[PDB]
Design a protein around this ligand. Structure first.
Ligand SMILES: Nc1nc2c(ncn2[C@@H]2O[C@H](COP(=O)(O)CP(=O)(O)OP(=O)(O)O)[C@@H](O)[C@H]2O)c(=O)[nH]1
Ligand SMILES: Nc1nc2c(ncn2[C@@H]2O[C@H](COP(=O)(O)CP(=O)(O)OP(=O)(O)O)[C@@H](O)[C@H]2O)c(=O)[nH]1
Ligand SMILES: Nc1nc2c(ncn2[C@@H]2O[C@H](COP(=O)(O)OP(=O)(O)OP(=O)(O)O)[C@@H](O)[C@H]2O)c(=O)[nH]1
Ligand SMILES: Nc1nc2c(ncn2[C@@H]2O[C@H](COP(=O)(O)OP(=O)(O)OP(=O)(O)O)[C@@H](O)[C@H]2O)c(=O)[nH]1
Ligand SMILES: [Mg+2]
Ligand SMILES: [Mg+2]
Ligand SMILES: [Mg+2]
Ligand SMILES: [Mg+2]
Lengths: 133, 434, 430, 434, 427
């Protein structure tokens, strides 16, 4: 049966009041930002975002440099292959030339020695003949 | 004059704004083109609508989104002549469900433009009360852009009230896995800048649409029309010459005993299907009893597990004080209704004579009398606990955190936001101890 | 978040890409000449995501067609929708990559890559709001794999803030074109781990097995394999092309699907499984069940061998949204042991009224499952069997590559497997 | 576009070139005068075009004696080649590697290189060189080695692939052919990328068994060799369903630089008589490739392991039928692969059926296939050759003929030690992994 | 490798040389005036190997005719085909070497050698691509043996890179009574071992034995012996004279036949054996390869092993049958071939048979059994040299005894080298 009704306000399209069933056990109701602060925090976040985008691009730049180093390495290997094939072949053709000329000279010197022996035979025949009877 | 500026942020905020402003137009007799053949009777509608040199009435509102699709529907739809193009503001790319993207990356490029528009609306006010901000906790814009805007609004309008209508995330209609992160992050940054926040859990409204309106799979159009009904009930005494919650400061006075515990529970009745066969009108006793039923709440939580620190009954329509007092007397007789020891057990009651209005062709039946209860109960801490637990499960593994860190946020901000919500949970416990 | 720029590289990339353009053109009511002749507004609402509007109401795919060899280009131009493509968007070399990742990535591919970037730059600069890039390619050859990954890193450098998405075809000895596929695939996975945001793993092992075991095709062809891929790609892109709330753009999809940056490899699923000559039913409970069926996965992994970190489920056709919601809740509750408990509400569902070309009802699952580690282990075992003996290595080192790149790619792929295993074993009670 | 330069060296290389270029002309509709009436323009890889519309082979024919090349110069196709691409000296290498490489070859090598340089100048996308020669002749062995070395200096690592005739006693012209074969293999090993060996005894026996020819002549052997060469080059000269270029042959067939000798197998080989031959399916012609009687080199693949198999199909062949045939081959226990090869199959398909020379021994078939397989069984051919070398070299028999030309005995030891290492390389490569 | 320059020295050399020119002229369709009246294009395809084309379509043998005696020239000019030879190519002295190798090599022969080189240089320099030289001579007299070997070393000095080939007639006590034939033959073998690339050993002992035992000629003459030589020479030069794959030139033949530089002495074989007044099957022809009765060197091929063999089949016969029979003859007789020279038997088939026959077989064998021919000469040499008999015939011409000991040692070393390879195993 206990209910304290208290009229609050009355107006053109409304009416208000407070209904109190029981008063409180404990008497009494007990038991700034700045543009600069905001801006400083937003700009610090922007710098972290830009720093990580820069790190991503720095790594992509490192991949582009590596790509250039593999193209260069393949070019250098092809050039060293050419250089080695060229001097191996020049060495082989020159050794072969020295050898073939040496074999030809040795066999011609053998035939030339036969000619020296032949004139020496001719010499003895001549003194056997003539200087007789 | 007591003008209020409405700020609709992101998809949820903008789509709820479409529903609210459509209902206000119907309630004040304003046509979609801004014309008014002056129904209502009084000129209090001027708190929410300014007037142009051609006799048109224009909402004191700003619609903002980081993407243009949703606001483009407002720019080209039924109410395109109701708003001037300068109050419909959009960027090109959204916040991709990421608070850090909305707060630190994309929001930063449109915030000055939004503040400039708000300043031009404030210049047309002789007695600016403050702001009503509509947004979701879950979206990247609703979370990140709203908190960024709240901070600047505190710098530019220190002694002005800021009231929120916030959408609490629900898996049935959820758009992102990271919604618990966005919710805890935005609550942390907004806590000290907001004066009073009316949370609406999509699951509670979704279940009310299924149970009370017989809608199998409710859409955002169904949910928002019901949200509009609740928002209209809460703003009715600012837009009509009412007697309770006559100014925005009165909301903090009547519902908020401590600055951090500013999340009142909303309950609404009756919610009846338009397609229902000619039913008899519900009495003041029946709609009052429905106020004390968990199934009619805007947030899923158990008031039996908590204590009330303030209670406001906003009746609307064919309602007489004698019938209200008789209804409240029976409820105290059969129910406990435990109040904290430092607050009196009782209610602040308001009757707004203007009838409840429904959108023609909508899902809601036109009723002779309705009631909206706003109660600050410690039981709402259950919604924070559910959200905090989901945050903890993911954050223990640092799941999805790289998305926020990649936008310039630090891990410490996640710890700070979570520690602040742990303090909020302890505050509800301490405040409701005796 | 409007435009997507599509790139197709190499034979496989251009074959599945032409098939993607042919299916989505039919769904959007676009004929072989680029003319719109549909009867629904949902078909044109988001047409600009994939098509440019040219003079005279014609729609032209925002697609760049790439190869180091011209034969593929000729076959696409000659194909059913070949005339729809922008002629200047066909970028091709004359040499070929010789099935060698190193030629595609460092030598011949590097010589053609700037001609490709000039064409994708023209498409990108024309965008009002570029979402990012979509690449179709195989990982087993030289062009799609080597040059495709070279393109990704070059695009990452010029568009670091855009989403990079791939449809990557994983090789299988069951339907193989070259002996060095495990090398080309491992070197590409290494690149994808570091430079893509979302990768759909389209496994030829899984496609061959669906055709052989389920469709009863004794000898499956690329046509049979590509029919499953085209339905899958139509399914995974549904939310990018039609009006809807969930995963409507490449970044919102990435935020919902990718909890850890390196774990961005998706296991696509599709139901019903059909052949090009096709049953006549499939109900909502039947469609939801296929989410855990290894037989319905486009990656040769068993979803019941691991746990789903995240899932996107797309249902298409005339079906009850209420029934889909009830069945998706039941499939999660009954199979709680196959979802990580520390990512709450990790399954997101979408329903679209327009079914894929040729079907009345369908389901597509985009899964981020720890079971994908089985696909990487399979590639790794094939890689090690060759690398242990240094077989075919002189073809890569002859292109300037070092042996260290192989060991690094192998380590990164094994670390990825070890990461998936770590989250598979992780409990909520740390 | 993707040009291939052909070099035909010595009697065997030149006579096989006569058969190949005659067959290419028949396959592309090129008349003996180089004219072609009024498409697939891939033949441009092997034929250049003059201002008068005449198609000219991208080829050089070289011999140290003029007799064999004189037949080209005065025959049916004398207008097809310009006289400057048919190069001959006066005196041959007398079955001596040393005379081909040094004494006689060094006099004409600069002229041959000058002509190849003029052909390379007409190439916009030179793929490399196809060198046709015997292992046994003094020119085929010695001049080819010298030319290979000079091509590595002028073109670096540009692809160099061979078609080499392995010696057979039935048609052998010299006792010293094992010496000429070992010396040329040693010199050429590091300069060649891939060598397709053809054993004359195997082609001789195929002509006797499959074509019913009592005593096969070089005309019979060469027409069959031309068929195999045409099959290997059909993927370069036509654009079929699946193509394989010079680079793809190398990458798929050569796992290690020295292991570059694929075995050639061809099917079907049917006599122009019979008539009741009933058309052989893709499965039947594929199965025939793994039958020893169809191999171009005498060796037993059952005694070895496959490391790579390239299938070159031509005619009425569909990819589905090829995959079905290769799948049954993968289930054959008697066809063993090395454990370090997960899959060793490269397939190429061309629509153009095998064209036969009018009045030849071969029947017109609807479909044919040429398999290029890297098998460790091919080491049997090297062992056979190495043993004959050892028998003679232990006594220094015939060595004075090479020494007299400037060669040293140390070159014989080095060449033999290199071939001993090659034999051990086939043994190591066929071993299972630990 | 086109032109061959032929030289014939002394009586024997000019008698077998005139016979060679008469047989190959008939085979190539060339009459006694040098006119071509053949029927086949195979006859003229390689006509330039042995003949020059003179004014008016006539063919003239690239032959130089040499003798220290001027009667041999007259008899050749008077013989059948005498008018075919170039008149200025007849180079003759007046003295005669008196069956003395020293007179031929050092005295009278040295006085005539420059007149011969005048004529062979003119022939050799006129060649487009000179293969080398072919010499017919005997080893038992003075001109053919002494002057013939002097010519070889002089031509070798001027043309060191050309092939030097000889048809060397070995003496026998059965046909000639000249006592010093063992000396002239040993001094010539010494020269041939060091300066020729290929030498066909035409043994008068073997020729006499075929005529006496097989042809039943009680008293054979040089005409009877030379008929076997002309058929043999037509047979061994078949591959130089007609289009073909095998041993088509003097250097390719040497490379196939000569495994060791000194072992270049060939044992020629021929089937069928005919007289000047008298067709075998393929198996019958192949069997004669191991028949001592068919050898033109008095050695038994079954007494040694073949290092290398060239088998030439002529006439209309099956190449398939020849191939089958040649494989059977080496499989059944594997012990008579050295195992360490694989595929050492090369076969050739020519459609044109020799003059007077329908089918023939010629075998060019490099057999270790040839050491029996050298041992026979060596025993005859030692029987005389041991007593220094007739030495003043050679020392009177300026020679030293040391040249004899050296020639003897070199010939015994040659025998010892054939024996070494005969006994050698593959092991
Ligand atoms: N699902 C499909 N896989 C394909 C198709 N074509 C090829 N592939 C697979 O792709 C892999 C390599 O084939 P490609 O033709 O794409 C090689 P690509 O052109 O990119 O480079 P190159 O090696 O330079 O030729 C291998 O695993 C094949 O089985 C196709 O149409 N569908
Ligand atoms: N088979 C042949 N052997 C012959 C012929 N003429 C001679 N001879 C043999 O040659 C040897 C004697 O040589 P020659 O008569 O040629 C002596 P040549 O003229 O060369 O020198 P000189 O008479 O000493 O001046 C001796 O063994 C004879 O039996 C012949 O026509 N055929
Ligand atoms: N009641 C209601 N909730 C909505 C509506 N639209 C979205 N939501 C909810 O809001 C959350 C998602 O936030 P949104 O407002 O769509 O996102 P946003 O603010 O536009 O942010 P971004 O799109 O990320 O830039 C989810 O919980 C949705 O269920 C709406 O019209 N009504
Ligand atoms: N298949 C085939 N093999 C041949 C042909 N001609 C020769 N040969 C073989 O090649 C080898 C001999 O080499 P050739 O090519 O004739 O000699 P060459 O290269 O001309 O060298 P030289 O004549 O010594 O300067 C033997 O094994 C012959 O059987 C031919 O037309 N076809
Ligand atoms: Mg939004
Ligand atoms: Mg390709
Ligand atoms: Mg030759
Ligand atoms: Mg005389």
């Amino acid at each position: 049966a206990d209910m304290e009704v208290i009229e609050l306000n009355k107006a053109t399209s409304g009416q208000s009041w407070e209904v109190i069933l029981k008063p409180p056990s404990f008497d009494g109701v007990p038991e700034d930002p700045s543009l600069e602060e905001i801006q400083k925090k937003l700009e610090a976040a922007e710098e972290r975002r830009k720093y990580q985008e820069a790190e991503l691009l720095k790594h992509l730049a490192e991949k582009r440099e590596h790509e250039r180093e593999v193209i260069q390495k393949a070019i250098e290997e092809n050039n060293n292959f050419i250089k080695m094939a060229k001097e191996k072949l020049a060495q082989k053709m020159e050794s072969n030339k020295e050898n073939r000329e040496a074999h030809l000279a040795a066999m011609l010197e053998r035939l030339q020695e036969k000619d020296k022996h032949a004139e020496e035979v001719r010499k003895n025949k001549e003194l056997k003949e003539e200087a007789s009877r | 004059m007591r003008e209020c500026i409405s700020i609709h942020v992101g998809q949820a905020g903008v789509q709820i704004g479409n529903a609210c402003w459509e209902l206000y137009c119907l309630e004040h007799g304003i046509q979609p083109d801004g014309q008014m053949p002056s129904g209502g009777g009084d000129d209090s509608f001027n708190t929410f609508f300014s007037e142009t040199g051609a006799g048109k009435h224009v909402p004191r509102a700003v619609f903002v989104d980081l993407e243009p699709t949703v606001v483009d529907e407002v720019r080209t739809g039924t109410y395109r002549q109701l708003f001037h193009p300068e109050q419909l503001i959009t960027g090109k790319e959204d916040a991709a469900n990421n608070y850090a993207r909305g707060h630190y990356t994309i929001g930063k490029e449109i915030v000055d433009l939004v503040l400039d528009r708000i300043r031009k609306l404030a210049d047309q006010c002789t007695g600016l009360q403050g702001f009503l901000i509509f947004h979701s906790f879950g979206g990247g814009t609703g979370s990140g852009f709203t908190s960024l805007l709240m901070e600047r609004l505190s710098v530019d309008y220190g002694k002005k009230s800021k009231l929120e209508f916030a959408i609490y995330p629900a898996p049935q209609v959820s758009t992102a896995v990271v919604e618990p992160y966005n919710s805890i992050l935005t609550t942390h940054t907004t806590l000290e800048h907001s004066d009073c926040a009316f949370m609406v859990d999509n699951e509670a409204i979704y279940d009310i649409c299924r149970r009370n309106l017989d809608i199998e799979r409710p859409t955002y159009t169904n949910l928002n029309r019901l949200i509009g009904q609740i928002v209209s009930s809460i703003t009715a005494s600012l837009r009509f010459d009412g007697a309770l919650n006559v100014d925005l400061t009165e909301f903090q006075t009547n519902l908020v005993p401590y600055p951090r515990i500013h999340f009142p529970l909303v309950t609404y009745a009756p919610v009846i299907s338009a397609e229902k066969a000619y039913h008899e009108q519900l009495s003041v006793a029946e709609i009052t009893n429905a106020c004390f039923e968990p199934a009619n709440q805007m947030v899923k939580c158990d008031p039996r597990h908590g204590k009330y620190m303030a209670c406001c009954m906003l009746y609307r329509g064919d309602v007489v004080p004698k019938d209200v007092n008789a209804a409240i007397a029976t409820i105290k007789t059969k129910r406990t209704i435990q109040f904290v020891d430092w607050c009196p057990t009782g209610f602040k009651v308001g009757i707004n004579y203007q009838p409840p209005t429904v959108v023609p062709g909508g899902d809601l039946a036109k009723v002779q009398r309705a009631v909206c209860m706003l109660s600050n109960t410690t039981a709402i801490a259950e919604a924070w606990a559910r959200l905090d637990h989901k945050f903890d499960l993911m954050y223990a593994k640092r799941a999805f955190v790289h998305w926020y860190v990649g936008e310039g946020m630090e891990e410490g901000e996640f710890s700070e936001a979570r520690e602040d919500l742990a303090a909020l949970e302890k505050d509800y416990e301490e405040v409701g101890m005796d | 978040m409007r435009e997507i720029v599509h790139i197709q590289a190499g034979q496989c990339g251009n074959q599945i890409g032409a098939k993607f353009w042919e299916i989505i053109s039919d769904e959007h009511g676009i004929d072989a000449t680029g003319a719109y002749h549909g009867d629904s507004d949902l078909q044109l609402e988001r047409i600009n995501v994939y098509y440019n509007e040219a003079s005279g109401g014609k729609y032209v795919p925002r697609a760049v067609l790439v190869d180091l060899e011209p034969g593929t280009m000729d076959s696409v131009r000659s194909g059913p929708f070949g005339q729809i493509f922008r002629p200047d968007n066909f970028v091709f070399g004359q040499s070929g990559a010789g099935n060698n990742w190193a030629k595609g990535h460092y030598t011949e591919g590097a010589e053609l890559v700037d001609s490709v970037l000039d064409v994708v730059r023209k498409e990108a600069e024309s965008c009002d709001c570029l979402q990012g890039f979509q690449l179709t390619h195989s990982l087993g050859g030289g062009t799609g794999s080597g040059m495709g990954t070279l393109l990704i890193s070059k695009i990452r450098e010029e568009y670091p803030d855009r989403i990079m998405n791939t449809y990557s075809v994983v090789p299988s000895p069951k339907v193989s074109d070259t002996v060095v596929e495990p090398y080309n695939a491992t070197l590409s996975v290494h690149q994808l781990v570091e430079n893509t945001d979302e990768t759909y793993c389209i496994d030829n092992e899984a496609l061959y097995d669906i055709c052989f075991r389920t469709l009863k095709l004794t000898t499956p062809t690329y046509g049979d394999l590509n029919h499953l891929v085209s339905l899958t790609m139509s399914g995974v892109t549904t939310c990018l092309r039609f009006p809807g709330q969930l995963n409507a753009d490449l970044r919102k999809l990435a935020v919902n699907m990718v909890p850890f940056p390196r774990l961005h490899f998706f296991m696509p699923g599709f139901a019903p499984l059909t052949s090009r000559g096709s049953y006549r039913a499939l109900t909502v409970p039947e469609l939801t069940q296929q989410m855990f069926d290894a037989k319905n996965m486009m990656a040769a992994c068993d979803p019941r061998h691991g746990r789903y970190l995240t899932v996107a489920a797309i249902f298409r056709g005339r079906m009850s949204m209420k029934e889909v919601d009830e069945q998706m809740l039941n499939i999660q509750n009954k199979n709680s042991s196959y979802f990580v408990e520390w990512i709450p509400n990790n399954v997101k569902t979408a329903v679209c009224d327009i079914p894929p070309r040729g079907l009345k009802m369908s389901a597509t699952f985009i899964g981020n499952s720890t079971a994908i580690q089985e696909l990487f282990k399979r590639i790794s075992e094939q890689f090690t069997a060759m690398f242990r003996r240094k077989a075919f290595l002189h073809w890569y080192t002859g292109e300037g590559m070092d042996e260290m790149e192989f060991t690094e790619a192998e380590s990164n792929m094994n670390d990825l497997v070890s990461e998936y295993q770590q989250y598979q074993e992780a409990t909520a009670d740390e």
